[PDB]
Amino acid sequence: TRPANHRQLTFEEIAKSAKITVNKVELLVMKALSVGLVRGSIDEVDKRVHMTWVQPRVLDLQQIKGMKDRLELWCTDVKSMELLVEHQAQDILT
Amino acid sequence: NQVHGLKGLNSKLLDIRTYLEKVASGKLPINHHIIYQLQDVFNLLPDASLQEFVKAFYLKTNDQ
Amino acid sequence: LVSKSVFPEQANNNEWARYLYYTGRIKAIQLEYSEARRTMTNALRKAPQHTAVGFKQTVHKLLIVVELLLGEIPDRLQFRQPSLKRSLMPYFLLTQAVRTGNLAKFNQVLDQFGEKFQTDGTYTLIIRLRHNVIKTGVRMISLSYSRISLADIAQKLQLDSPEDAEFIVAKAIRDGVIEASINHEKGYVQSKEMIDIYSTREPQLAFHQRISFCLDIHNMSVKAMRFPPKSYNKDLES
Amino acid sequence: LQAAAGMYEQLKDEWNRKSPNLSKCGEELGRLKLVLLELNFLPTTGTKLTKQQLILARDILEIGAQWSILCKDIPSFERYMAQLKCYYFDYKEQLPESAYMHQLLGLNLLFLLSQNRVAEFHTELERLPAKDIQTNVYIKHPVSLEQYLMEGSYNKVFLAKGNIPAESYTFFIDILLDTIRDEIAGCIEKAYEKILFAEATRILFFSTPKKMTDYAKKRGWLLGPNNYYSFASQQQKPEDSTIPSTELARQVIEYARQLEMIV
């Protein structure tokens, strides 16, 4: 949902939310990866769990909104970038 | 092919967004597969690194 | 006049060498040793063979001085090899004075040989070289071994004080020559240096400029090459 | 009064080193102009014949120059000073005369330096030599300073003690001094973290901790009564750590496009 630009999450966020101790969250996060809700690696010393991938989920209220936002960012970049690619290398461009 | 590629991506990319709108309002039936696949595209993202070229091409040419 | 001009490449090889020598000479006085060295090194190389020889020796006198001004200590063989070795002998001595960092040899040489230097035209640059004698020594030592006490640099060069050294570092740092900083937390000079540039994007840039620079020349290489045989084929021959 | 050589030079002498005045030696300097138009219609061609006219030319502009320096106005001085120089160069120092030229000459050297017009400074250095024709007392101040300043012995300068001997030089010496103090002041920030107040007065060319507090504050260190060198210093030391990645790569696409086109 929330990050287009990043995909890493801190533990501390879970911890406060749950109101469950820090020691448990590291262990809970490990179960999360094993089920396959998320795939990635956990780096303890940076205090992040980095998601390489997120499981598909059936239509949710938060979800549909994020997808649109990311498609918009994507359209805009592709048009800007198209001008750069076309602008340079004139002699092969035909 | 690379110049065209960017243009191709744009033509395809618009459709994906209108489809998402239709489901939201202007009611259209959801094909579940499509929604499942969409979310996958955004998650793989990393940032860029290196790649560069040497002074060597010039040396040969100067020899001639 | 130098600033305004870039200098195009259609004009013969002898004339280019004259353009570079003159340019190099003037700029260095200001303390623009950096641009001037490039021109002078190109100048020597641009000149002709045996006919050139009289201009070449004057250019060879100026050349050691401009490369010395940068913070480099030129090669000793170079002075030796042209067979103007004798005339080159004070220029080599100036290079040695810069190596040790001692004022006393540098100052006495400048005066004795001053009659010979004035003749070449080099003398104006030679006064600016006094700064370099101490400057080259401190950059050499700091580069090699990063953290050294302020007291240690003072003895080596024969400077007045640990302050006297700190002030050399202060003028330099902004320009970037010595490239170190003074930490008066205990009194040492600490070098900026670190290493592991290949886990950072920064090398792609280094290479990128080198290729861009090469590139404009490559289009030029193909183009120029064909022109002279074609002129000769167009010319009528027996 | 009315002045022009061969019949006047009253005002040069009356201006300073007799009594202070410029209320006759620069207030009446508007009618001197009218003879100047004649005089200046002749060093189009710079020859030895022109000499006679040339010394009269210089004379108003030496008194002109002198009123400007005392008055503490740098721009007026600059217009007056500039004329005298071209009027020396007519076989390169044809006129190196008068001791009411002497002061101007030294002043001109330090003046160029305060602006940090490095090119002009060298141009004058070479043009001028009358530093032993009119002999090293006040003219000595820029000369000492060039040797020291090039060597990088800031301690040796003889510009933070060239305030005390002055003809009316003290003003020029002060603006040039302020330039010297700044150059060092910014650098030191990068140099090291929170260092003593006393250490930060010593090699900051300051006279007291009070002068240092106000001067440091504008620069961006010692905003409070505690050093703040530390912000600046830390940024410089690691050069090999910085990856915003895409931002730093600086458009790989452009370089590639330049490269591909030829083949």
UniProtKB/Swiss-Prot annotation, chain A:
Source organism phylogeny: Eukaryota, Metazoa, Chordata, Craniata, Vertebrata
Residues of the full protein shown: 283 to 376 of 376
Functional note: Component of the 26S proteasome, a multiprotein complex involved in the ATP-dependent degradation of ubiquitinated proteins. This complex plays a key role in the maintenance of protein homeostasis by removing misfolded or damaged proteins, which could impair cellular functions, and by removing proteins whose functions are no longer required. Therefore, the proteasome participates in numerous cellular processes, including cell cycle progression, apoptosis, or DNA damage repair.
Subunit structure: Component of the 19S proteasome regulatory particle complex. The 26S proteasome consists of a 20S core particle (CP) and two 19S regulatory subunits (RP). The regulatory particle is made of a lid composed of 9 subunits including PSMD13, a base containing 6 ATPases and few additional components.
Family statement drawn from the similarity comment of this UniProt entry: Belongs to the proteasome subunit S11 family.
Sequence positions bearing N6-acetyllysine: 16
Cleavable signal peptide: none
This protein's name: 26S proteasome non-ATPase regulatory subunit 13
Disulphide bridges, residue numbers: none
Highest rank taxon of the organism: Eukaryota
